[PDB]
Write a protein that binds this ligand. Structure first.
Ligand SMILES: Nc1nc2c(ncn2[C@@H]2O[C@H](COP(=O)(O)OP(=O)(O)OP(=O)(O)O)[C@@H](O)[C@H]2O)c(=O)[nH]1
Ligand SMILES: Nc1nc2c(ncn2[C@@H]2O[C@H](COP(=O)(O)OP(=O)(O)O)[C@@H](O)[C@H]2O)c(=O)[nH]1
Ligand SMILES: COc1cc(CCc2nc3ccccc3s2)cc(OC)c1OC
Ligand SMILES: [Mg+2]
Lengths: 431, 436, 155
């Protein structure tokens, strides 16, 4: 399998999504016009995974840009790589969503979901062996959460034999525009647990605390947060885009990372943590990359992994380094932290090396973990959700769009069950 | 002739077949393009090496091999590598979507889309034979294709070739090399469904080969090319009697006679010695007694176990090189006397000996040094049940909580087969316990 | 009716409608089905002008709905800082309890309204107040890992 059809929905989905394209295009050697000017053959071996090969060496991203308002439409084009997207792949409505999940999932988003499926169906026919779909979106808004989850269900039933992959950014009061974000996020998790195979939880609470407390940026912006998102999205897709000698695709990741169909919410980590332009990270080593990768301060989800147990872990090392020193340092962590990995899944930690490092860094590491400690993210969303829902606050914004009250109690109940499963497998023993 | 068809399934099976057929050509003096100047039989021929190679009218020798994989990545390298001209191009069969380390995909959903093409291509090679005696199947335990498709292929071969033999060369998983999480599952599932369809299966523990490459060959991180060249050196020792004149295991039927007492405990233990690094080219040459002693040391085994903890049911010794038979008998006399090699009381306690007086071949580009004499011991001991226990244990740890089962159920497979395959292994454990 | 109209005008933020209806003798302390007064809805939907107008004309700053929610609960929940201080200026019970045991400090802590948390502490919010599960506002900050809130609750 090879081709991946990328979809980005909503303002946040297109913001972090556009950052993803200008990052991997830089890594593969593509310019805003679509031409290739890199200096390595390994940059072009697995290039069909994200790009289409057009006329004369013109690599076009296999991306589809969705939003319910034309505001973000012109913002992506004016960006550095805005002209490389296929103009026919822009499906933008007129009347926005207004942070209303019901407006994106039932009203304004339903009138546009058919127009998007026609673009996805075209991009799938030009695929030799399609392997799945990748989505970037936020859960706090209305377009990326509401219409995004509706787009997932429509594709899940039209392409059921394909892997559905999401990059779902979680809302937080630290970076909040409204108190209905726990509503929108909870309604989306109810759709993600039943329709996606892999979800990367990029908690805005974690990104803020990294920029505020670790990067010492006293007033973080969306550019600071998205700088961490791009560095994480680039790492988690490294094995998909660069050769190596292992066999990496979305299904082999899901088969190895997801032991239970509902517990498919991964905790991403990255080392070293850097701000936009600082040149600080200069002398990092393998014993340091391994330590920071599992340190709770390098997690893109605000959850302490030492409060739970790892089910499966996939580690990516990038740059020229001693592969011998990688295997011994990884073995070093799985020994001193023996009780942090479940023993009923033997050899649940996978290591990987890649010669090509990300831009601005000579060595790097990317952490992907399926830990039971992710329940702290869902418990935080549930407590905020329950606080709002028990006072029936702003509920008429949602029920006015044909939505029933039982849809909220089910989303509350289903997410409580999700936390119950993590706690269930956190206390399970071998014996 | 009594031809033999080799089938290679999955990445492990294909890459191992690459090193085996590369070495086979060097032993028989065959060029990469298929030309053999030595034996000057025009076409067809009737020498012993024709059991593995067919002969065209233009003097080209084409291996009787089939390479199958559900994704084209690995086989495409064989189509463009050094031996791109060697094999039959129509016997290099690929799909587009691998089994994703899933037995169910390899056997059911994905494997069904190519199984009839593989059998028609196998039938094409089978009809090129005057007296086909069976198949040699190379595959992995943990791979989706190597476990699922191989079990599917072995079930179909028994229907189409009821009287023909089937020998396995299986790769036992090991945490050092790579492996997926669900490899204990795939190993148990493919063993349950292939047990009745296989006459003799040679397990190759990746951890055993890994430890030999680091201790004996001084390799820090052994690559797949390092492991395979060492495994192909051992496969060549097992199949040497099929490709040359011999008196021990001259055909696939004789393997079951000499190594398999009962059709269920058909997993012989292979031991190869000596393994000497190519950097030590001017090494002292070990005697026949020294290399024979090294066959009863745990470090030289292909499956990690302890034969001293178990009983022997059969034992064949396959020497290669400057090996005088009188020195073998003296070596066996010293093994039987000083060492406590307990046999079961219902089998002949005699060692079967076969000697190939050709020096062992090593591939240029390998890590092995040339030796005057090598030996591969094929023994059927009950101690190899420990290897099944290690697989059964990892299976039970995951299946007790039904981990990863949904990936198999959602690919045309019922959950009951998990309980069937495990109970079949628990019966295989009981068989080794009751034998001795 | 005039009661229902003042309730809907206080929710939608119709400033002149509130002044007109109040002129026609509309009940400032009218209640809907769940016991919400115009002051509850004004504090919930962030209409600071209507809050001060209602308080000037006999609005009960400590009225409770069916669930025991006071206007200060809802203002602390949604995150309207100025409304919180206007409510506190007119004598709002900073330690009022609803049917879930939540105090205004609990709701502002769960929703991460750090500035409102600081104001409630200045006005004597009980730091030892527990909800029905026994959790205080500091217990909530430790359970969710909100370092910023925990430092505030320890000033
Ligand atoms: N000795 C040896 N073992 C290998 C080699 N390649 C893969 N393996 C082993 O095979 C196991 C995985 O099975 P694969 O053969 O790679 O999988 P597959 O048969 O191609 O089926 P898929 O899951 O569809 O890819 C791993 O545990 C490896 O240890 C090889 O070249 N030599
Ligand atoms: N990390 C990150 N988060 C964002 C960005 N833009 C918006 N968000 C978050 O997304 C939520 C708002 O959703 P949004 O995408 O704007 O609404 P939508 O257009 O309907 O999908 C808020 O909680 C924001 O914190 C961004 O550029 N980066
Ligand atoms: C190691 O990094 C990766 C591995 C895979 C699949 C294989 C796995 N085997 C195991 C074994 C144990 C635990 C987890 C796994 S994932 C796919 C990846 O990207 C699509 C990838 O890059 C992140
Ligand atoms: Mg494969």
């Amino acid at each position: 399998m090879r081709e991946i059809v990328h979809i980005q929905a909503g303002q946040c989905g297109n913001q972090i999504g556009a950052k993803f394209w200008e990052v991997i295009s830089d890594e593969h050697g593509i310019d805003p016009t679509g031409s290739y000017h890199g200096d390595s053959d390994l940059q072009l071996e697995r290039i069909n995974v994200y790009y289409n090969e057009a006329t004369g060496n013109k690599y076009v991203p296999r991306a589809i840009l969705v939003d319910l308002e034309p505001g973000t439409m012109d913002s992506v084009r004016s960006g550095p790589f805005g002209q490389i997207f296929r103009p026919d792949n822009f499906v933008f409505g007129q009347s926005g969503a207004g942070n209303n999940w019901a407006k994106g999932h039932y009203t304004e988003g339903a009138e546009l979901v058919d127009s998007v499926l026609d673009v996805v169906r075209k991009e799938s026919e030009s695929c030799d062996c399609l392997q799945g779909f990748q989505l970037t979106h936020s859960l706090g808004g209305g377009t990326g959460s509401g219409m995004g989850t509706l787009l997932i269900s429509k594709i899940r039933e039209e392409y059921p034999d394909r892997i559905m992959n999401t990059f779902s950014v979680m809302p937080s009061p630290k970076v909040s525009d409204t108190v209905v974000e726990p509503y929108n996020a909870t309604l989306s998790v109810h759709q993600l647990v039943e329709n996606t195979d892999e979800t990367y939880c990029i908690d805005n609470e974690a990104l803020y605390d990294i920029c505020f407390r670790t990067l010492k940026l006293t007033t973080p912006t969306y550019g600071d947060l998205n700088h961490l998102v791009s560095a994480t999205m680039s790492g988690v897709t490294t094995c998909l885009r660069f050769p190596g000698q292992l066999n990496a695709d979305l299904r082999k990741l899901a088969v190895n990372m997801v032991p239970f169909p509902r517990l498919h919410f991964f905790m991403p980590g990255f080392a070293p943590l850097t701000s936009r332009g600082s040149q600080q990270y200069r002398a990092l080593t393998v014993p340091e990359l391994t330590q920071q990768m599992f340190d709770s301060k390098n997690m893109m989800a605000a959850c302490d992994p030492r409060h739970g147990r790892y089910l499966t872990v996939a580690a990516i090392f990038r740059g020229r380094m001693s592969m011998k020193e990688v295997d011994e340092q990884m073995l070093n962590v799985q020994n001193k932290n023996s009780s942090y990995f479940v023993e009923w899944i033997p050899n649940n930690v996978k290591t990987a090396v890649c010669d090509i490092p990300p831009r601005g860094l000579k060595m790097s590491a990317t952490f992907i973990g399926n830990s039971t400690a992710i329940q702290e993210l869902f418990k935080r969303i549930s407590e905020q959700f329950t606080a709002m829902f028990r006072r029936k606050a702003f509920l008429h914004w949602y029920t006015g769009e044909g939505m029933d009250e039982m849809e909220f109690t089910e989303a509350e109940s289903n997410m409580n069950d999700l936390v119950s499963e993590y706690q269930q497998y956190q206390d399970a023993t071998a014996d | 002739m009594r031809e033999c068809i080799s089938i290679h399934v999955g990445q492990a099976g294909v890459q191992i077949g690459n090193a085996c057929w590369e070495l086979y050509c060097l032993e028989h003096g065959i060029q990469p393009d298929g030309q053999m100047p030595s034996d000057k039989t025009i076409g067809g021929g009737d020498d012993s090496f024709n059991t593995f190679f067919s002969e065209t009218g233009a003097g080209k020798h084409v291996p009787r091999a089939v390479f199958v994989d559900l994704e084209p990545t690995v086989i495409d390298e064989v189509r463009t590598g050094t031996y791109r001209q060697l094999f039959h191009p129509e016997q290099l069969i690929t799909g587009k979507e691998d089994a994703a380390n899933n037995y169910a995909r390899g056997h059911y959903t994905i494997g069904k889309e190519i199984i009839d093409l593989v059998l028609d291509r196998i039938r094409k090679l089978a009809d090129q034979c005057t007296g086909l005696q069976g198949f040699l199947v190379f595959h992995s335990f943990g791979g989706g294709t190597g476990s699922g498709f191989t079990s599917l292929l072995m079930e179909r071969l028994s229907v189409d070739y009821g009287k023909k033999s089937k020998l396995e060369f299986s790769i036992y998983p090991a945490p050092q090399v790579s492996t997926a999480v669900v490899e204990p599952y795939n190993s148990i599932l493919t063993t349950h469904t292939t047990l009745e369809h296989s006459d003799c299966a040679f397990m190759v523990d990746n951890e055993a080969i890994y430890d030999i490459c680091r201790r004996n060959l001084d390799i820090e991180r052994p690559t797949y090319t390092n492991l395979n060249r060492l495994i192909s050196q051992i496969v060549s020792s097992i199949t040497a009697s099929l490709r040359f004149d011999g008196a021990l295991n001259v055909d696939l039927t004789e393997f079951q006679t000499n190594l398999v007492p009962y059709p269920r405990i058909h997993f012989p233990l292979a031991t190869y010695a000596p393994v000497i690094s190519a950097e030590k080219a001017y090494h002292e040459q070990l005697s026949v007694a020294e290399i024979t002693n090294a066959c009863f040391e745990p470090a030289n085994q292909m499956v990690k176990c302890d034969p001293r903890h178990g009983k022997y049911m059969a034992c064949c010794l396959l020497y290669r090189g400057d090996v005088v038979p009188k020195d073998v008998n003296a070596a066996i006399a010293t093994i039987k006397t000083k060492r406590s090699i307990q046999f079961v009381d219902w089998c002949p306690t005699g060692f079967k000996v076969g000697i190939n007086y050709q020096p062992p071949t090593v591939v240029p580009g390998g890590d092995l040094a040339k030796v005057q004499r090598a030996v591969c011991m094929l023994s059927n001991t009950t101690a190899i049940a420990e290897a099944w226990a290690r697989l059964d244990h990892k299976f039970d740890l995951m299946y007790a909580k039904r981990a990863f089962v949904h990936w198999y159920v959602g690919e045309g497979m019922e959950e009951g087969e998990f309980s069937e395959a495990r109970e079949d292994m628990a019966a295989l454990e009981k068989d080794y316990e009751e034998v001795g | 009716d005039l009661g229902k109209k003042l309730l809907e005008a206080a929710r939608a933020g119709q400033d002149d409608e509130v002044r007109i209806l109040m002129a026609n003798g509309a009940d400032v302390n009218a209640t809907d089905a769940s016991g919400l007064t115009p002051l509850h809805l004004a504090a919930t939907y962030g209409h600071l002008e209507i809050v001060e107008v209602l308080l000037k004309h006999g609005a009960d700053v400590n009225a409770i709905d069916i669930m025991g929610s006071t206007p200060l609960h809802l203002a602390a929940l949604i995150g309207h800082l100025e409304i919180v201080e206007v409510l506190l200026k007119h004598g709002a019970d900073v330690n009022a309890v609803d049917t879930w045991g939540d105090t205004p400090l609990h709701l502002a802590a769960i929703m991460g309204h750090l500035e409102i948390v600081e104001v409630l502490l200045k006005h004597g919010a009980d730091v030892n107040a527990q909800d029905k599960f026994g959790k205080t506002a500091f217990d909530i900050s430790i359970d969710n890992g909100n370092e910023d809130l925990a430092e505030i609750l320890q000033k």
